[PDB]
């Protein structure tokens, strides 16, 4: 419990991280939902998300 916080449309991960989402896709990760769930825990790091995607943490 106690996870997440406030925000709005301008702050959703699909536009908060749109560069990193493209960089993950362009390396080979077309699973948008996994990339989002990985960037959400990595703090928006491309390689931090990539490590989670490789390990199957998403």
């Amino acid at each position: 419990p106690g996870i997440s916080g406030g925000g709005g449309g301008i702050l959703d991960p699909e536009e908060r991280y749109e560069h990193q989402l493209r960089q993950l896709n362009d390396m080979g990760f077309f699973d948008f939902d996994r990339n989002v769930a990985a960037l959400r825990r990595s703090g928006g790091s491309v390689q931090g998300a990539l490590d989670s995607l490789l390990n199957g943490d998403v």
Partner: protein
């Protein structure tokens, strides 16, 4: 044969190799284009982190393939 290498920042490099070049040998070419030391960088293809002692043929790399590079210190 040629290949391309793309940073985590978003720059695309282009290099001249053979299917018998190693991952080590590929990193060592980017040092001619940007100066990035081949012990700091790593390479990525199909999302998989590539091993230094492997070839381009080992990952079925083709001519004009669009790979990525990863610095152990980020650099951006």
């Amino acid at each position: 044969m040629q290949i391309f290498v793309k940073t985590l920042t978003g720059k695309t490099i282009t290099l001249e190799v053979e299917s018998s070049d190693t991952i080590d040998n590929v990193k060592s070419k980017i040092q001619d284009k940007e100066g990035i030391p081949p012990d700091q960088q790593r390479l990525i293809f199909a999302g998989k982190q590539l091993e230094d002692g492997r070839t381009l043929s080992d990952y079925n790399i083709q001519k004009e393939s669009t790979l990525h590079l990863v610095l152990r210190l980020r650099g951006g």
